[PDB]
Design a protein around this ligand. Structure first.
Ligand SMILES: Nc1nc2c(c(=O)[nH]1)N[C@@H](/C(S)=C(/S)[C@H](O)COP(=O)(O)OP(=O)(O)OC[C@H]1O[C@@H](n3cnc4c(=O)[nH]c(N)nc43)[C@H](O)[C@@H]1O)C=N2
Ligand SMILES: Nc1nc2c(c(=O)[nH]1)N[C@H]1C(S)=C(S)[C@@H](COP(=O)(O)OP(=O)(O)OC[C@H]3O[C@@H](n4cnc5c(=O)[nH]c(N)nc54)[C@H](O)[C@@H]3O)O[C@H]1N2
Ligand code: SF4
Ligand code: SF4
Ligand code: SF4
Ligand code: SF4
Ligand code: F3S
Ligand SMILES: O=S([O-])[O-]
Ligand SMILES: O=[Se]([O-])O
Ligand SMILES: [Mo]
Ligand code: NA
Ligand code: NA
Ligand code: NA
Ligand SMILES: [Zn+2]
Lengths: 895, 329
């Protein structure tokens, strides 16, 4: 006898359902910040399902990262077989957006694109061609293909970090870096976490367990959010301010902390600019130039209280190192070149309070005060709990208690996100959050610091990526700043009258002084637009301006995609890209310190090709086109570069070395310190941890936490002052009233009564998975907009009624969800459903303009200069207001 | 009957479930992608309070009353939700105008009232309730089947509807008070959760446990005194079956939520009461809920004072294999 039970044989039906003959490693190459390791299961050449591989190496004493994953991810293969797939190259035959196509061969498709690219260069300028492809960390090889293409032919690239509103503008202002953040495992080390405009139950799904686990291990957590969001059901305290008033909350906490002396004086003195001296007459930093013949305008003073004399602090912009290192993309300047110990306080005792007199070069005498003194005075006057209570609607008692708890628990940390980052004045608000961290001394400590989370912006091996995408150098590459590019070319109306904020003058002056780029040059129109790995039209702010003004300037729009998204639907040529499980690519994120990847489980389906292969194939047809059109080589005076189009393919592939996807992936690993040593084979078997990281040591068994090279190794902060700089004495900052952190009320230029909120949903990754049938079945079959019952009832609106939301920019009609946890006075629409989904007109971007805060255009003040994705205007959208009413063309009954 | 030699047992930590539906998706793409199964969610996750899936299932009837088998209702299809369907081809590829609307007109769906719950701002409250078949020690479904198509596995206590023995009598659908057997109108068979026995047989955790992203699921055999399920159920006694008064004696247990902010008073100040009403939890899990919460709050407070709490360590689950049969596959 078998030793088998009565019904065992029949049960073979179900065991057969869980079987496979091949198992391969997969990843989901979308902007979600998961970078979740996965296995892909195929049987008889068909992908059957995926499942978390759960094989990230644990660290001692803290929860493992495993399993990660999420609801989109476990149905990711739906986009292999679903009704959305691009199978063949498509050329448009009706009007843009109609979905009227004809199938073309690759030859005809790529030749059309090649003909147009050569003509455009020949007849106009190379910079009238552009490629948009965001978030290289998501899929560095695929990102590098279009970028390398553009790099050799002279097309310009775009920015994404700031365009999306995710670049932490205030942190760059404060710390002189592009950005950095702890990996989420470090949350487990904190005793006190403030979730500040962040909804990780829905927007950090694979990492959220660390939060509830921290709480069970004894941590306290605070949620700060206008609506009672999904995250908030598990926190210990919920604070609910008026939208965009968080600045007042934070400054009042600063006030309490300072007035009650709950702060780390030693830290303030060593690591910030709060001791640096300000002239009472010009309200600028006292500088060495003011006092000494031939003195630096980039060196400063503090008052040393143990010697009763002024002293020049070490490490500011004017202090040069030793040996000078190479520029490091995510730093204002390479302050790593300085020696360890360099800005150690030693036995210095910088004053934080008092007035002092000093004698100028010209002999006359000026009163000076330290920044902290000015800050303290202004806070005592303007940012009491009682005043902030009136503004935010948070009680004065609550604000005080939050303040004391934040400053007493150690470590404490702030976790901020879209809710606080996507506002016009988010730069000043993050400066304020960084002021709170600085005051409590927790920057650079495990479980501490100001930690921002948004999208998949950070690729730790960034030099290996720059090697593959921009091999002749970043300084020999055209970049626009996409927020500016959209604003100008879509001829946006921001509704901000010049006499309030002269956006036009700032923008124009920033460009003609070369602080910010403007592409194309000489006022030419953009003519050719490559879009892939981002749904740029669907997600674009000022969308109605874009469709009406920018889109028709474009002679050719090319979308390369796995699926027909809205951008592709509105394009001229659509090319079929291989699914994530039919391609090879790396996949990384800032949330965890490990290198993920995907590999082919089956050959690319239909006539689809991998992104690397597509731009390689294009390169040949462009060679051919260039020969036909007798335009093979041309001068490019901007870079003193004679380009040879007849050798584009060899340029693309480094004379054939990088013609396979895997060589391109390995080329990346080989060319960064964070990854050199790692092979594709290793990664194929198991996720590997990065060898090193950015602004801290990466230590065995310990979660990364940023900025330790400054906080611990006492290297200077890459700022003008060499510290965490809270005083920015540039003209544009005085103009806006933001030389110091302080409260800036939101833009009310939309003269409509509801604030328009557009947060991210658990049910999609941006536009991707919006149209997934299963995801839609776990909702109400289409896009949604949320209203408080207190606003819906007087308007005659019922749950699931159609509703109409509009302002001067546009209009959207969407079914409503009435939710008690929503705050009255605002509506929330889960961002950017696809245009073709269940909407009677428009989309979430129809009611959003593009707006540019002047402080984000400053490009001539130390660490504030333009570098793509380092600094630039944020595409904010949370200041938007709209009106709402019941749509009456269709009022179905319920049952 | 014949009691099983071992009993597969689940513990769901309502302190940790983030309602991401990952488990709902994983189960569907593994076992219910077949004909007639589009409306079936063997594993689902509902907002509490709410209608649940199917709508008002908690008053459908079934289970036992003083030992007497009950015959409840058979939910109509609209209480499950007609699975929405879409014509993407026409709009994206065929030049048809008009939005890709859902058919039918949306009126109901398994997760229709997500995050709505109960109470007026600023005391709105809800949490997530994952559900599955409870592989009951007293399975109502199994007794009700006039064809003896439903059996309880001797080796692991998993309850299974034998698809060849099943003739579509639907007594089981009437009698399960959890509404977890689903009548397949195409095949004329009942379908339900198979406790992932093929994975269990290979020493792999069920998919809704192994793939749980919030790290809220525990599985094991309750006879293993070193399992997290024995620890939560028998030792610390902080995990309760859902609706015990149904009399089926579930083998899926819940750790009730103790995490959560306080009721906000009219002056804006915190009360001592939680936003989640005790009365709501007692409704779900009966009169033990108060004492379980006191234990959970007491142990969490030790961790807050930097003291040791082994119960908290169990819920934390720093290693997955401390929570579950190995999830690796
Ligand atoms: N009011 C409001 N507005 C907002 C926001 C808000 O919060 N409120 N949020 C922002 C933010 S923060 C972001 S990150 C954008 O939504 C990101 O959109 P994105 O186009 O990159 O993702 P998406 O997923 O939509 O597009 C990904 C596209 O790339 C396809 N794809 C995915 N993988 C590949 C691939 O491997 N190769 C190729 N060639 N294509 C691939 C994908 O199908 C989709 O079309 C922006 N607007
Ligand atoms: N499942 C899923 N996860 C995602 C994404 C996705 O598309 N799907 N997108 C990823 C990316 S790229 C983004 S940028 C992030 C965004 O995700 P988050 O960083 O979490 O930010 P939001 O979703 O915009 O809103 C966060 C919360 O803050 C609230 N809040 C809104 N306005 C304000 C305010 O003025 N003040 C305060 N204190 N709170 C406010 C919102 O109502 C909301 O509850 O998520 C990433 N994670
Ligand atoms: S989609 Fe993003 S989050 Fe969801 S599983 Fe794939 S990678 Fe992880
Ligand atoms: S996966 Fe785990 S956490 Fe997400 S819903 Fe299912 S049970 Fe709750
Ligand atoms: S839950 Fe319903 S179906 Fe599963 S065993 Fe108990 S009674 Fe039978
Ligand atoms: S145990 Fe297996 S079958 Fe039962 S619900 Fe969880 S996944 Fe679906
Ligand atoms: S009662 Fe029995 S016959 Fe099938 S429909 Fe239910 S298992
Ligand atoms: O695997 S299924 O989607 O054909
Ligand atoms: O890459 Se982030 O701006 O989503
Ligand atoms: Mo983002
Ligand atoms: Na032309
Ligand atoms: Na689908
Ligand atoms: Na249609
Ligand atoms: Zn499938």
């Amino acid at each position: 006898i078998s030793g088998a039970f009565e019904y065992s044989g029949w049960e073979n039906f179900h065991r057969t359902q869980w079987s496979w003959d091949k198992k391969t490693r997969g990843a989901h190459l979308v902007n979600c910040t998961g970078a979740c390791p996965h296995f892909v299961y195929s049987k008889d050449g068909v992908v059957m399902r995926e499942e978390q591989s759960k094989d990230i190496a644990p660290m001692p004493n803290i929860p493992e990262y495993n399993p990660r994953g999420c609801n989109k991810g476990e149905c990711g293969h739906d986009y292999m077989y679903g009704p959305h797939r691009i199978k063949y190259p498509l050329i448009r035959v009706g009007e843009r957006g109609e979905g009227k196509w004809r199938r073309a061969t690759w030859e005809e498709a790529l030749d059309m694109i090649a003909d147009k690219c050569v003509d455009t260069i020949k007849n106009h300028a190379p910079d009238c061609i552009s490629v948009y492809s965001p978030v290289p960390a998501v899929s560095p090889v695929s990102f590098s293909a279009g970028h390398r293409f553009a790099h050799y032919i002279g097309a310009h690239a775009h920015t994404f970090y700031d365009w999306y509103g995710d670049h932490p503008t205030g942190q760059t202002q404060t710390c002189g870096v592009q950005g950095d953040t702890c990996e989420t495992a470090d949350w487990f080390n904190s005793k006190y976490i403030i979730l500040w405009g962040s909804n990780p139950t829905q927007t950090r799904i694979p990492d959220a367990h660390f939060l509830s686990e921290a709480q069970l291990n004894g941590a306290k957590i605070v949620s700060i959010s206008p609506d009672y969001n999904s995250s908030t059901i598990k926190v210990d305290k919920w604070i609910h301010p008026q939208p965009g008033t968080d600045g007042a909350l934070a400054m009042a906490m600063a006030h309490v902390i300072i007035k009650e002396k709950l702060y780390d004086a030693h830290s303030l003195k060593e690591q910030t600019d709060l001791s640096y001296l300000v002239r009472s007459d010009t309200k600028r930093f006292l500088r060495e130039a003011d006092v000494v013949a031939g003195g630096s305008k980039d060196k400063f003073y503090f008052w040393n209280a143990k010697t009763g004399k002024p002293v020049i602090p070490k490490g500011s912009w004017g202090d040069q190192p030793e040996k000078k290192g190479s520029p490091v993309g995510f730093l204002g300047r390479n302050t790593f070149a300085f020696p360890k110990g360099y800005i150690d306080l030693g036995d210095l005792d910088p004053a934080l309070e008092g007035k002092f007199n000093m004698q100028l070069l010209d002999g006359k005498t000026v009163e000076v005060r330290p920044v902290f003194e000015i800050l303290k005075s202004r806070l005592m006057a303007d940012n009491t709990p009682e005043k902030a209570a009136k503004i935010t609607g948070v009680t004065a008692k609550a604000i005080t208690e939050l303040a004391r708890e934040f400053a007493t628990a150690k470590p404490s940390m702030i976790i901020c996100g879209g809710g606080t980052q996507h506002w016009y004045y988010s730069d000043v608000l993050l400066r304020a959050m960084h002021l709170l961290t600085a005051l409590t001394g927790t920057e650079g400590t495990n479980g501490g610091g100001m930690n921002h989370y948004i999208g998949q912006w950070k690729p730790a091996f960034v030099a290996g990526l720059v090697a593959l995408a921009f091999p002749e150098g970043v300084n020999k590459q055209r970049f626009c700043q996409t927020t500016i590019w959209t604003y100008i070319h879509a001829e946006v109306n921001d509704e901000i009258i010049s006499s309030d904020i002269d956006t036009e003058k700032y923008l124009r002056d920033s460009i003609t002084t070369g602080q910010m780029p403007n592409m194309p040059e000489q006022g030419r129109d953009p003519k050719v637009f490559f879009v892939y790995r981002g749904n740029w039209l669907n997600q674009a702010k000022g969308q109605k301006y874009v469709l009406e003004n920018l889109w028709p300037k474009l002679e050719l729009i090319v979308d390369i995609n796995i699926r027909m998204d809205s951008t592709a639907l509105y394009s001229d040529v659509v090319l079929p890209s291989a699914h994530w499980y039919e391609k090879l690519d790396l996949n990384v994120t800032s949330e965890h310190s490990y290198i993920n990847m995907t590999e082919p489980a089956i050959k690319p389906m239909w006539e689809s090709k991998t992104d690397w292969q597509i731009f390689l194939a294009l390169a040949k047809r462009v060679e051919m086109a260039a020969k036909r059109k007798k335009y093979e080589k041309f001068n490019d005076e901007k870079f003193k570069w004679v380009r040879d189009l007849s050798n584009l393919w060899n340029q693309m592939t480094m004379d054939g070395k990088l013609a396979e996807d895997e060589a391109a992936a390995q080329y990346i690993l080989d060319n960064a310190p964070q990854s050199k040593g790692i092979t594709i084979q290793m990664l194929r078997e198991k996720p590997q941890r990065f060898k090193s990281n950015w602004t801290s040591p990466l230590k065995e068994g310990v979660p990364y936490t940023p900025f330790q090279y400054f906080v611990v190794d006492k290297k200077p902060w890459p700022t003008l002052t060499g510290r965490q700089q809270f005083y920015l004495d540039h003209d544009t900052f005085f103009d806006m009233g933001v030389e110091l952190p302080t409260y800036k009320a939101p833009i009310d230029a939309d003269k409509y009564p509801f604030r328009f909120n557009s947060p991210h949903s658990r049910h999609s990754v941006h536009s991707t998975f919006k149209d997934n049938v299963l995801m839609l079945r776990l909702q109400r079959g289409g896009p949604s907009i949320e209203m408080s019952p207190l606003d819906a009832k007087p308007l005659g609106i019922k749950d699931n009624d159609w509703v109409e939301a509009w302002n001067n920019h546009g209009k959207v009609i969407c079914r409503v969800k009435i939710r008690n946890g929503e705050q009255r006075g605002r509506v929330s629409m889960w961002h950017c459903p696809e245009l073709y989904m269940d909407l009677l007109t428009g989309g979430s971007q129809s009611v959003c303009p593009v707006r540019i805060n002047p402080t984000n255009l400053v490009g001539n003040y130390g660490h504030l200069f333009f570098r793509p994705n380092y600094y630039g205007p944020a595409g904010s959208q949370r200041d938007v207001r709209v009106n709402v009413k019941r749509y009456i063309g269709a009022t179905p009954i319920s049952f | 009957m014949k009691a099983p030699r071992r009993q597969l047992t689940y513990v769901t930590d309502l302190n940790k479930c983030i309602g991401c539906q990952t488990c709902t998706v994983a189960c569907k793409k593994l076992w219910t992608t077949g004909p007639g199964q589009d409306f079936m969610y063997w594993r689902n996750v509902e907002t509490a309070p709410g209608l649940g899936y199917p709508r008002n299932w908690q008053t459908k009837g079934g289970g036992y009353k003083n030992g007497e088998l009950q015959k409840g209702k058979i939910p109509p299809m609209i209480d499950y939700g007609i699975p929405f369907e879409f014509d993407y081809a026409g709009r994206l590829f065929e030049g048809k105008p008009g939005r890709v609307r859902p058919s039918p007109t949306p009126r109901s769906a398994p997760n229709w009232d997500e995050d709505q719950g109960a109470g007026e701002y600023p005391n709105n409250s809800f949490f997530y309730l994952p559900r599955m078949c409870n592989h009951c020690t007293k399975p109502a479904c199994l007794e009700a089947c006039p064809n003896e198509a439903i059996y309880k596995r001797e080796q692991d206590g998993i309850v299974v509807i034998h698809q060849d023995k099943c003739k579509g009598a639907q007594a089981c659908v009437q009698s399960c008070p959890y509404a977890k057997p689903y009548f397949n109108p195409l095949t004329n068979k009942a379908n339900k959760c198979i406790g992932c026995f093929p994975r269990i047989e290979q020493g792999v955790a069920p998919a809704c446990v192994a793939q749980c992203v919030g790290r809220a699921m525990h599985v094991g055999f309750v006879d293993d005194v070193n399992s997290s399920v024995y620890k939560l159920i028998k030792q610390y006694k902080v995990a309760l079956p859902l609706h015990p008064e149904f009399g089926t004696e579930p083998n899926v247990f819940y750790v009730p939520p103790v995490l959560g902010p306080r009721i906000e008073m009219a002056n804006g100040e915190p009360s001592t009461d939680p936003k989640i009403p005790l009365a709501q939890l007692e409704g779900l899990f009966g009169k033990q809920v108060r004492d379980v919460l006191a234990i959970l709050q007491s142990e969490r407070e030790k961790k807050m004072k930097g003291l040791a709490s082994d119960l908290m360590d169990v819920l934390i689950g720093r290693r997955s294999t401390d929570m579950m049969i190995s999830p690796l596959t």
